[PDB]
Write a protein that binds this ligand. Structure first.
Ligand SMILES: *[C@@H]1O[C@H](CO)[C@@H](O[C@@H]2O[C@H](CO)[C@@H](O[C@@H]3O[C@H](CO[C@@H]4O[C@H](CO)[C@@H](O)[C@H](O)[C@@H]4O)[C@@H](O)[C@H](O[C@@H]4O[C@H](CO[C@@H]5O[C@H](CO)[C@@H](O)[C@H](O)[C@@H]5O)[C@@H](O)[C@H](O)[C@@H]4O)[C@@H]3O)[C@H](O)[C@H]2NC(C)=O)[C@H](O)[C@H]1NC(C)=O
Ligand SMILES: Nc1ccn([C@@H]2O[C@H](CO)[C@@H](O[P@](=O)(S)OC[C@H]3O[C@@H](n4ccc(=O)[nH]c4=O)[C@H](O)[C@@H]3O)[C@H]2O)c(=O)n1
Ligand SMILES: *[C@@H]1O[C@H](CO)[C@@H](O[C@@H]2O[C@H](CO)[C@@H](O)[C@H](O)[C@H]2NC(C)=O)[C@H](O)[C@H]1NC(C)=O
Ligand SMILES: *[C@@H]1O[C@H](CO)[C@@H](O[C@@H]2O[C@H](CO)[C@@H](O)[C@H](O)[C@H]2NC(C)=O)[C@H](O)[C@H]1NC(C)=O
Ligand SMILES: *[C@@H]1O[C@H](CO)[C@@H](O)[C@H](O)[C@H]1NC(C)=O
Ligand SMILES: *[C@@H]1O[C@H](CO)[C@@H](O)[C@H](O)[C@H]1NC(C)=O
Ligand SMILES: *[C@@H]1O[C@H](CO)[C@@H](O)[C@H](O)[C@H]1NC(C)=O
Length: 158
Protein backbone atom coordinates (compact mmCIF):
# COMPACT_ATOMS: atom_id res chain seq x y z
CA UNK A 1 0.00 0.00 0.00
CA UNK A 2 2.62 2.68 1.05
CA UNK A 3 5.26 3.56 -1.46
CA UNK A 4 8.78 3.51 -0.02
CA UNK A 5 11.12 5.57 -2.27
CA UNK A 6 14.82 6.37 -1.98
CA UNK A 7 17.63 8.23 -3.66
CA UNK A 8 20.60 6.42 -5.19
CA UNK A 9 24.09 7.79 -5.77
CA UNK A 10 25.02 9.33 -9.14
CA UNK A 11 27.96 11.73 -9.72
CA UNK A 12 26.19 12.91 -12.86
CA UNK A 13 23.20 14.22 -10.87
CA UNK A 14 23.54 17.60 -9.16
CA UNK A 15 22.19 17.52 -5.60
CA UNK A 16 21.80 14.68 -3.07
CA UNK A 17 22.82 12.05 -5.71
CA UNK A 18 26.26 13.70 -6.17
CA UNK A 19 26.69 14.25 -2.39
CA UNK A 20 25.88 10.54 -1.83
CA UNK A 21 28.47 9.53 -4.46
CA UNK A 22 31.17 11.75 -2.77
CA UNK A 23 30.34 10.27 0.63
CA UNK A 24 30.20 6.67 -0.50
CA UNK A 25 26.47 6.38 0.28
CA UNK A 26 24.52 4.12 -2.03
CA UNK A 27 20.91 4.52 -0.93
CA UNK A 28 19.22 7.28 1.10
CA UNK A 29 15.49 7.14 2.03
CA UNK A 30 13.32 9.81 0.45
CA UNK A 31 10.03 8.80 2.03
CA UNK A 32 7.24 6.38 2.91
CA UNK A 33 4.11 7.52 1.20
CA UNK A 34 0.54 6.46 2.00
CA UNK A 35 -2.27 7.72 -0.33
CA UNK A 36 -3.24 10.63 1.97
CA UNK A 37 -1.14 13.82 1.71
CA UNK A 38 -1.19 15.91 4.87
CA UNK A 39 -2.33 19.51 4.46
CA UNK A 40 -2.43 22.28 6.98
CA UNK A 41 -0.76 22.66 10.34
CA UNK A 42 1.03 19.50 11.66
CA UNK A 43 -0.18 18.07 15.01
CA UNK A 44 3.45 17.97 16.16
CA UNK A 45 6.42 19.94 14.92
CA UNK A 46 9.30 17.55 14.24
CA UNK A 47 12.51 18.53 16.05
CA UNK A 48 16.08 18.13 14.86
CA UNK A 49 16.78 15.56 17.59
CA UNK A 50 13.75 13.48 16.51
CA UNK A 51 14.62 13.69 12.80
CA UNK A 52 18.30 12.84 13.36
CA UNK A 53 17.13 9.48 14.80
CA UNK A 54 16.51 8.39 11.13
CA UNK A 55 20.14 7.25 10.82
CA UNK A 56 21.66 7.25 7.34
CA UNK A 57 18.94 9.33 5.69
CA UNK A 58 20.62 12.28 4.05
CA UNK A 59 18.77 15.56 3.56
CA UNK A 60 18.13 16.49 -0.08
CA UNK A 61 18.89 20.16 0.80
CA UNK A 62 22.43 21.62 0.28
CA UNK A 63 21.52 24.19 3.01
CA UNK A 64 22.32 21.53 5.56
CA UNK A 65 25.17 20.11 3.40
CA UNK A 66 22.89 17.09 2.73
CA UNK A 67 22.67 16.06 6.38
CA UNK A 68 19.50 16.94 8.37
CA UNK A 69 16.67 18.01 8.69
CA UNK A 70 14.95 19.85 5.82
CA UNK A 71 13.88 16.75 3.72
CA UNK A 72 13.24 14.76 6.96
CA UNK A 73 10.88 17.57 8.25
CA UNK A 74 9.19 17.99 4.84
CA UNK A 75 8.48 14.18 4.93
CA UNK A 76 6.84 14.39 8.35
CA UNK A 77 4.95 17.57 7.31
CA UNK A 78 3.59 16.27 3.98
CA UNK A 79 3.23 12.49 4.63
CA UNK A 80 3.78 11.79 8.29
CA UNK A 81 1.59 13.55 10.85
CA UNK A 82 -1.92 12.89 9.47
CA UNK A 83 -1.15 9.20 8.71
CA UNK A 84 0.97 8.08 11.74
CA UNK A 85 -0.50 10.63 14.26
CA UNK A 86 2.55 10.37 16.53
CA UNK A 87 6.11 10.97 15.43
CA UNK A 88 7.62 8.06 17.44
CA UNK A 89 6.19 5.13 15.25
CA UNK A 90 6.96 7.15 12.07
CA UNK A 91 10.63 7.74 13.21
CA UNK A 92 10.93 3.95 13.98
CA UNK A 93 9.53 2.88 10.57
CA UNK A 94 11.69 5.43 8.64
CA UNK A 95 14.82 4.48 10.60
CA UNK A 96 14.28 0.71 10.11
CA UNK A 97 13.55 1.32 6.37
CA UNK A 98 16.77 3.24 6.02
CA UNK A 99 18.76 0.55 7.99
CA UNK A 100 17.57 -2.06 5.41
CA UNK A 101 18.58 0.34 2.59
CA UNK A 102 22.07 0.89 4.06
CA UNK A 103 22.60 -2.88 4.53
CA UNK A 104 21.16 -4.06 1.16
CA UNK A 105 15.86 -5.54 0.26
CA UNK A 106 16.14 -6.00 -2.75
CA UNK A 107 12.73 -5.12 -4.17
CA UNK A 108 14.21 -2.23 -5.97
CA UNK A 109 12.38 -0.65 -8.95
CA UNK A 110 13.63 2.41 -10.87
CA UNK A 111 11.50 5.60 -10.57
CA UNK A 112 13.74 8.18 -12.29
CA UNK A 113 16.82 7.83 -14.43
CA UNK A 114 19.58 9.94 -15.98
CA UNK A 115 20.50 8.25 -19.23
CA UNK A 116 24.33 8.35 -19.39
CA UNK A 117 25.63 8.30 -23.03
CA UNK A 118 29.28 7.38 -22.17
CA UNK A 119 28.19 4.18 -20.40
CA UNK A 120 24.99 3.67 -22.50
CA UNK A 121 23.19 3.14 -19.11
CA UNK A 122 20.06 4.37 -17.38
CA UNK A 123 21.62 5.54 -14.06
CA UNK A 124 18.82 5.27 -11.47
CA UNK A 125 18.68 8.35 -9.23
CA UNK A 126 15.51 7.29 -7.35
CA UNK A 127 13.98 3.82 -6.77
CA UNK A 128 11.03 2.38 -4.89
CA UNK A 129 9.89 -0.99 -3.59
CA UNK A 130 7.12 -1.54 -6.27
CA UNK A 131 7.05 -1.08 -10.12
CA UNK A 132 5.99 2.32 -11.46
CA UNK A 133 5.98 4.34 -14.77
CA UNK A 134 9.52 5.58 -15.43
CA UNK A 135 10.83 9.13 -15.97
CA UNK A 136 14.05 9.91 -17.91
CA UNK A 137 14.89 6.25 -18.71
CA UNK A 138 15.91 5.39 -22.32
CA UNK A 139 13.85 2.37 -23.55
CA UNK A 140 15.89 -0.76 -24.28
CA UNK A 141 18.95 0.27 -22.21
CA UNK A 142 20.22 -1.42 -19.02
CA UNK A 143 19.81 0.05 -15.53
CA UNK A 144 22.58 1.01 -13.03
CA UNK A 145 21.37 1.02 -9.36
CA UNK A 146 24.34 2.57 -7.42
CA UNK A 147 26.84 0.61 -9.62
CA UNK A 148 24.72 -2.55 -9.92
CA UNK A 149 23.88 -3.41 -13.54
CA UNK A 150 20.36 -4.85 -14.08
CA UNK A 151 18.57 -5.62 -17.37
CA UNK A 152 15.17 -4.30 -16.43
CA UNK A 153 13.73 -1.54 -14.23
CA UNK A 154 13.46 -3.95 -11.22
CA UNK A 155 16.54 -5.14 -9.16
CA UNK A 156 16.45 -8.06 -6.75
CA UNK A 157 20.16 -8.23 -5.74
CA UNK A 158 21.70 -7.41 -2.31
C1 LIG B 1 1.47 2.50 5.81
O1 LIG B 1 1.13 3.80 6.27
C2 LIG B 1 0.10 3.79 7.27
C3 LIG B 1 -0.13 5.28 7.54
O2 LIG B 1 -0.99 5.63 6.46
C4 LIG B 1 0.63 3.11 8.55
O3 LIG B 1 -0.54 3.07 9.40
C5 LIG B 1 -0.37 3.82 10.59
O4 LIG B 1 0.44 3.07 11.49
C6 LIG B 1 0.66 3.76 12.74
C7 LIG B 1 1.54 2.83 13.59
O5 LIG B 1 2.86 2.79 13.05
C8 LIG B 1 -0.67 3.99 13.47
O6 LIG B 1 -0.37 4.89 14.55
C9 LIG B 1 -0.97 4.57 15.80
O7 LIG B 1 -2.31 5.07 15.60
C10 LIG B 1 -3.07 5.08 16.83
C11 LIG B 1 -4.48 5.56 16.47
O8 LIG B 1 -5.02 4.60 15.54
C12 LIG B 1 -6.44 4.64 15.31
O9 LIG B 1 -6.95 3.52 14.55
C13 LIG B 1 -6.94 3.56 13.10
C14 LIG B 1 -6.02 2.44 12.60
O10 LIG B 1 -6.63 1.57 11.62
C15 LIG B 1 -6.74 4.98 12.51
O11 LIG B 1 -7.31 5.18 11.20
C16 LIG B 1 -7.49 5.99 13.39
O12 LIG B 1 -7.58 7.34 12.88
C17 LIG B 1 -7.14 5.95 14.88
O13 LIG B 1 -6.65 7.25 15.29
C18 LIG B 1 -2.42 5.79 18.03
O14 LIG B 1 -3.15 5.40 19.20
C19 LIG B 1 -0.96 5.31 18.19
O15 LIG B 1 -0.18 5.80 19.31
C20 LIG B 1 0.75 4.85 19.87
O16 LIG B 1 0.26 4.68 21.20
C21 LIG B 1 0.28 5.84 22.07
C22 LIG B 1 -1.22 6.04 22.35
O17 LIG B 1 -1.33 5.71 23.74
C23 LIG B 1 -1.87 4.48 24.23
O18 LIG B 1 -1.73 4.59 25.65
C24 LIG B 1 -0.38 4.64 26.17
C25 LIG B 1 -0.04 6.06 26.67
O19 LIG B 1 0.99 6.71 25.90
C26 LIG B 1 0.68 3.93 25.29
O20 LIG B 1 1.89 3.53 25.96
C27 LIG B 1 -0.03 2.72 24.66
O21 LIG B 1 0.86 1.76 24.05
C28 LIG B 1 -1.23 3.13 23.81
O22 LIG B 1 -1.00 2.87 22.40
C29 LIG B 1 1.10 7.05 21.55
O23 LIG B 1 1.46 8.06 22.52
C30 LIG B 1 2.42 6.42 21.10
O24 LIG B 1 3.45 7.30 20.60
C31 LIG B 1 2.22 5.14 20.28
O25 LIG B 1 3.34 4.97 19.39
C32 LIG B 1 -0.19 5.38 16.86
O26 LIG B 1 -0.03 6.77 16.46
C33 LIG B 1 -1.70 4.63 12.52
O27 LIG B 1 -3.01 4.58 13.09
C34 LIG B 1 -1.80 3.97 11.14
N1 LIG B 1 -2.64 4.81 10.27
C35 LIG B 1 -3.56 4.27 9.41
C36 LIG B 1 -4.25 5.39 8.67
O28 LIG B 1 -3.75 3.06 9.28
C37 LIG B 1 0.95 1.64 8.20
O29 LIG B 1 1.79 1.10 9.25
C38 LIG B 1 1.92 1.62 7.00
N2 LIG B 1 2.34 0.23 6.76
C39 LIG B 1 3.63 -0.06 6.39
C40 LIG B 1 3.81 -1.54 6.23
O30 LIG B 1 4.47 0.82 6.18
N1 LIG C 1 12.85 24.83 1.51
C1 LIG C 1 13.17 23.59 1.14
C2 LIG C 1 14.50 23.28 0.70
C3 LIG C 1 14.76 22.01 0.37
N2 LIG C 1 13.80 21.04 0.45
C4 LIG C 1 14.15 19.57 0.00
O1 LIG C 1 15.48 19.50 -0.47
C5 LIG C 1 15.52 19.44 -1.94
C6 LIG C 1 16.56 20.37 -2.54
O2 LIG C 1 16.19 21.75 -2.36
C7 LIG C 1 14.08 19.68 -2.37
O3 LIG C 1 13.85 19.08 -3.65
P1 LIG C 1 12.35 19.21 -4.21
O4 LIG C 1 12.07 20.68 -4.24
S1 LIG C 1 11.32 18.24 -3.81
O5 LIG C 1 12.81 18.79 -5.68
C8 LIG C 1 13.75 19.52 -6.48
C9 LIG C 1 14.62 18.55 -7.27
O6 LIG C 1 15.29 17.58 -6.38
C10 LIG C 1 14.84 16.27 -6.66
N3 LIG C 1 14.75 15.41 -5.34
C11 LIG C 1 14.03 15.93 -4.28
C12 LIG C 1 13.93 15.26 -3.12
C13 LIG C 1 14.59 13.98 -2.94
O7 LIG C 1 14.52 13.31 -1.91
N4 LIG C 1 15.30 13.53 -4.04
C14 LIG C 1 15.43 14.20 -5.26
O8 LIG C 1 16.07 13.76 -6.21
C15 LIG C 1 13.52 16.47 -7.41
O9 LIG C 1 13.23 15.29 -8.14
C16 LIG C 1 13.89 17.67 -8.29
O10 LIG C 1 14.77 17.34 -9.37
C17 LIG C 1 13.32 19.06 -1.18
O11 LIG C 1 13.28 17.64 -1.13
C18 LIG C 1 12.50 21.37 0.87
O12 LIG C 1 11.63 20.48 0.91
N5 LIG C 1 12.22 22.65 1.22
C1 LIG D 1 13.85 -4.93 6.86
O1 LIG D 1 14.34 -6.14 6.28
C2 LIG D 1 13.78 -7.37 6.76
C3 LIG D 1 14.38 -8.51 5.92
O2 LIG D 1 13.70 -8.52 4.66
C4 LIG D 1 12.24 -7.41 6.73
O3 LIG D 1 11.91 -8.60 7.50
C5 LIG D 1 11.19 -9.67 6.88
O4 LIG D 1 9.89 -9.23 6.49
C6 LIG D 1 8.98 -10.24 6.04
C7 LIG D 1 7.58 -9.62 5.86
O5 LIG D 1 7.25 -8.56 6.76
C8 LIG D 1 8.92 -11.55 6.86
O6 LIG D 1 8.91 -12.73 6.02
C9 LIG D 1 9.98 -11.72 7.97
O7 LIG D 1 9.34 -11.73 9.27
C10 LIG D 1 11.21 -10.78 7.97
N1 LIG D 1 12.45 -11.54 7.75
C11 LIG D 1 13.62 -11.35 8.44
C12 LIG D 1 14.70 -12.28 7.96
O8 LIG D 1 13.80 -10.52 9.33
C13 LIG D 1 11.72 -6.17 7.49
O9 LIG D 1 10.30 -6.14 7.33
C14 LIG D 1 12.29 -4.86 6.92
N2 LIG D 1 11.76 -3.63 7.53
C15 LIG D 1 11.32 -2.56 6.78
C16 LIG D 1 10.83 -1.40 7.60
O10 LIG D 1 11.33 -2.51 5.55
C1 LIG E 1 17.76 3.14 14.14
O1 LIG E 1 18.47 2.16 13.37
C2 LIG E 1 19.86 2.17 13.75
C3 LIG E 1 20.60 1.35 12.68
O2 LIG E 1 21.01 2.18 11.58
C4 LIG E 1 20.02 1.73 15.22
O3 LIG E 1 21.37 1.57 15.71
C5 LIG E 1 21.42 0.30 16.39
O4 LIG E 1 21.40 0.56 17.80
C6 LIG E 1 21.60 -0.58 18.65
C7 LIG E 1 21.34 -0.21 20.12
O5 LIG E 1 19.94 -0.08 20.40
C8 LIG E 1 22.99 -1.21 18.38
O6 LIG E 1 23.23 -2.34 19.24
C9 LIG E 1 22.88 -1.71 16.92
O7 LIG E 1 24.04 -2.47 16.55
C10 LIG E 1 22.71 -0.47 16.01
N1 LIG E 1 23.08 -0.62 14.59
C11 LIG E 1 23.80 0.41 14.06
C12 LIG E 1 24.17 0.19 12.61
O8 LIG E 1 24.10 1.41 14.71
C13 LIG E 1 19.12 2.52 16.20
O9 LIG E 1 18.94 1.79 17.43
C14 LIG E 1 17.70 2.81 15.66
N2 LIG E 1 17.13 3.98 16.35
C15 LIG E 1 15.79 4.08 16.59
C16 LIG E 1 15.25 5.31 17.26
O10 LIG E 1 15.06 3.15 16.24
C1 LIG F 1 32.19 13.90 -10.81
O1 LIG F 1 31.57 14.99 -11.50
C2 LIG F 1 32.32 16.18 -11.80
C3 LIG F 1 31.45 16.87 -12.87
O2 LIG F 1 30.66 17.92 -12.31
C4 LIG F 1 33.71 15.90 -12.41
O3 LIG F 1 34.52 17.09 -12.57
C5 LIG F 1 34.47 14.74 -11.73
O4 LIG F 1 35.54 14.40 -12.64
C6 LIG F 1 33.56 13.52 -11.44
N1 LIG F 1 34.19 12.36 -10.78
C7 LIG F 1 34.06 11.07 -11.24
C8 LIG F 1 34.77 10.04 -10.41
O5 LIG F 1 33.42 10.74 -12.24
C1 LIG G 1 30.02 18.87 3.44
O1 LIG G 1 30.21 17.64 4.16
C2 LIG G 1 31.39 16.92 3.78
C3 LIG G 1 31.41 15.45 4.26
O2 LIG G 1 31.11 15.19 5.64
C4 LIG G 1 32.68 17.74 3.98
O3 LIG G 1 33.64 16.93 3.26
C5 LIG G 1 32.51 19.12 3.31
O4 LIG G 1 33.59 20.01 3.61
C6 LIG G 1 31.20 19.85 3.70
N1 LIG G 1 31.09 21.15 3.00
C7 LIG G 1 30.96 22.37 3.61
C8 LIG G 1 30.86 23.49 2.60
O5 LIG G 1 30.91 22.52 4.84
C1 LIG H 1 27.80 0.58 -2.53
O1 LIG H 1 27.57 -0.06 -3.79
C2 LIG H 1 28.59 -0.89 -4.37
C3 LIG H 1 27.95 -1.65 -5.55
O2 LIG H 1 27.19 -2.79 -5.12
C4 LIG H 1 29.23 -1.80 -3.29
O3 LIG H 1 30.22 -2.62 -3.94
C5 LIG H 1 29.80 -0.93 -2.14
O4 LIG H 1 30.34 -1.82 -1.15
C6 LIG H 1 28.67 -0.11 -1.45
N1 LIG H 1 28.92 0.93 -0.44
C7 LIG H 1 28.29 0.97 0.79
C8 LIG H 1 28.66 2.14 1.67
O5 LIG H 1 27.49 0.12 1.17
Amino acid sequence: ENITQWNLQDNGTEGIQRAMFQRGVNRSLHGIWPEKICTGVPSHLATDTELKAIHGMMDASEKTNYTCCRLQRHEWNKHGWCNWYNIEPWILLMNKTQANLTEGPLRECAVTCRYDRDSDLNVVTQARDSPTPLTGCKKGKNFSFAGILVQGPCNFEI
